[PDB]
A paper describes a structure:
Ethylamine (EA), the precursor of theanine biosynthesis, is synthesized from alanine decarboxylation by alanine decarboxylase (AlaDC) in tea plants. In this study, we solved the X-ray crystal structures of AlaDC from Camellia sinensis (CsAlaDC) and SerDC from Arabidopsis thaliana (AtSerDC). CsAlaDC and AtSerDC are Group II PLP-dependent amino acid decarboxylases, which exhibit numerous structural features common to other amino acid decarboxylases. The overall structure of CsAlaDC or AtSerDC is homodimeric with two subunits exhibiting an asymmetrical arrangement.
Numbering used by the authors:
A (entry chain A), B (entry chain A): 62 to 69, 80 to 481
Write the structure that this text describes.
């Protein structure tokens, strides 16, 4: 459905009204992807009048004056507080998304250790493997437990067979498909007891969704630069919500010296992946953090976990295979067989799993509308004498599978 | 000037009114950077209500439904027509800027030729060298004529000393500082006559500013995939104008197969540098191309060249060193000595050069306000018996220098 451009009104603002309609509709039924669709930023749309560009370092003002560094630096300072690094220990910037933050953090680690072996789990986001290939790093794929966590036994095994070289590591704070959280503490411990001291490994934390969310609980492996991590990224258009993709990458200031170069025509430094940078995003994220604070976010997070547990419980009671990890708003379940149902609710699918990500816009009323439809349609899919439901035990563990075999065991 | 975030109105919408004021002011006096500040996109700011995300390939719809691919594909088709490649010969996407397009095009070339030597001029944008380092390519810096063009003699010399390996080449369609245009035709010719056939070289065209502008003249070395180029990038927030940085990268479809990988949870492919992608940009660029067409752009371009020639002429008549290349809106001139004057007009500086880029928002009335101030202040800078003006002959040629020595020669 492409929309051809013709040489020279009505036809154009006609299109905006129709498109706006299809977006309202798509927004109503969206469940599959970790994007917060509850956007409360109406006062800021004045600013679409200016060409805001934070071109260069956030902490060194370029000669391009139409920028939002006041906001950007505010937001970054908040993130530094959130992850416990002090003003004079940290560098970072507001990115174009979680994949830019991954490319930045992995690049930083390659520069700390050019001979470094790179390690990540099999359930790392495609951005991580893209980065290693772009960067010509040796990528060792570490195995994974049933639930998605990195397997620190297989990790240990792999560390010891490359004991000469330093270790560069990506950890998944909330894997894309299953919503697992790599055990930072155990990973650190495993390194130390294979004779990797702090000065022979670099850890990047990919927290595109859950990295934002986890500091608002009193639970789980804390993300803090008091541990020997190297950098942490988050996507701003995931939990916080932002009309355009953005994110936040924060690293140790010591680490940024190897990337940072003066660029005379900016009167700034280039330590970012990008050149020109979105300067609306920093304002949008500043507005949100201010309106809501750590209390407003903690609420939204706790309600999202509650609503995911609800969804999971309702699915199990309908005898549909489903899992929800401890620290997660990602409900993995039996992949709907009706692919037009998949497209209507915009579900992400891998193999025999689909998932719903319960973002602030995802309400109980909306989960019920969905469970209604899914249950009605499921009845026509696996009726005798057709094959009967797929077994998700290999994906989510047999405790969570409700196929013909595993429903009996519970 | 950072802006601290505090836990919970007036204080916030107070800030927006003050910030909006400083942006109006900064927009009034901006001359140094290639950003079109004449933004006519008021009807589209409704859409800041949606989380538009073109996540994945522009031509394969992902399951995330809140996207602008209708627009994106329209815009890309227009660019394909503009650079003369047919619907079934080309792939491309709307990027986050000219640096993403550079990283994409250089990556494509590295995959066509993994053993390839990379060549660019000394006056390539910092993005180009950043890419080669990120990508661990061998970068051979080719020398440059006075005016900024790549020196195809020094090119030839360098080609022949690496005659075994294939050649990957970046060409600067409008260099950042001086506004030069690498001679594509001559570069091609030089390759052919050093025994590089089409299947042993890849050319990327960096056209962040002037790549958009040049097809609207009947002059200069035409950008066309009928010649053996590999890819062309442009920045959308440069000439066309866009509140957020964006761009357009177009390559040959044959070339994209080496990067493109299916990602099951998108139900799309990943052939981009990025993951999540701005889906407002494609709409903004679609609106602009439609309102104005090839006629509206041709006008804006011709007026920008006219206004640059004006600025240059006025500068020479005040006996201020200045150059304007043939195919350029970039007026290079004696770097103001008053750095607060530099910051007031937001000029980009390198060495003894500054420059004004004459973008559609840059009017004659505004150029005159600037020439007035510059001329008044210049009188206090080089009065006897202080040193007298710097010599820009090494930078811009002695025909364009008006120092104490070279002003005599003309
Ligand atoms: Ca329960
Ligand atoms: Ca003239
Ligand atoms: Zn089973
Ligand atoms: Zn001179």
């Amino acid at each position: 459905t492409s929309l051809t451009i013709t040489e020279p009104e009505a036809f154009m603002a006609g299109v905006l009204v129709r498109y706006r309609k299809t977006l309202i509709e798509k927004t109503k039924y969206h469940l599959g992807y970790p994007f917060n669709l509850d956007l409360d930023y109406g006062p800021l749309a004045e600013l679409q009048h200016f060409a805001i560009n934070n071109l260069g370092d956030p902490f060194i003002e370029s000669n391009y004056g139409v920028h939002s560094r006041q906001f950007e630096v505010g937001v970054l300072d908040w993130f530094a507080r959130l992850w416990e690094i002090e003003q004079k220990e940290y560098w970072g910037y507001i990115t174009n998304g979680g994949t830019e933050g991954n490319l930045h953090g992995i690049l930083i680690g390659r520069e700390v250790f050019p001979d470094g072996i790179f390690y990540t789990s099999r359930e790392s986001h495609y951005s991580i493997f893209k980065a290693a290939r772009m960067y010509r790093m040796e990528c060792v794929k570490v195995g994974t437990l049933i639930n998605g966590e990195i397997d620190c036994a297989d990790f240990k095994a792999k560390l010891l067979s490359n004991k000469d070289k330093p270790a560069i590591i990506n950890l998944n704070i909330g894997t894309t498909v299953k919503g697992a959280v790599d055990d930072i503490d155990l990973v650190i411990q495993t390194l130390e007891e294979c004779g990797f001291s702090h000065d022979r490994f670099y850890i990047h934390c990919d927290g595109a969704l859950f990295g934002f969310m986890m500091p608002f609980l009193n639970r789980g492996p804390k993300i803090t630069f008091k541990k020997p991590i190297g950098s942490v990224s988050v996507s701003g258009h995931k939990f916080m919500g932002c009309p355009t993709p953005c994110g936040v990458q924060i690293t140790r200031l010591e680490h940024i010296n190897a990337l940072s170069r003066n660029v005379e025509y900016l009167a700034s430094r280039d330590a970012t992946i990008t050149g020109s940078r979105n300067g609306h995003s920093p304002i949008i994220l500043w507005y949100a953090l201010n309106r809501k604070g750590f209390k407003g976010f903690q609420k939204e997070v706790q309600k999202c976990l509650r609503n995911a547990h609800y969804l999971k419980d309702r699915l199990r009671e309908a005898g549909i295979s489903a899992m929800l990890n401890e620290l997660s708003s990602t409900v993995v379940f039996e992949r709907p067989l009706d692919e037009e149902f998949v497209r209507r609710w915009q579900l992400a699918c891998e193999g025999n799993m689909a998932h719903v990500i319960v973002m602030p816009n995802v309400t109980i009323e909306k989960l019920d509308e969905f469970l209604n439809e899914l249950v009605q349609k499921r009845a026509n899919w696996y009726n005798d004498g057709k094959a009967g439901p797929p077994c998700l035990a290999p994906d989510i563990g047999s405790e969570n599978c409700d196929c013909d075999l595993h429903k009996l065991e519970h």
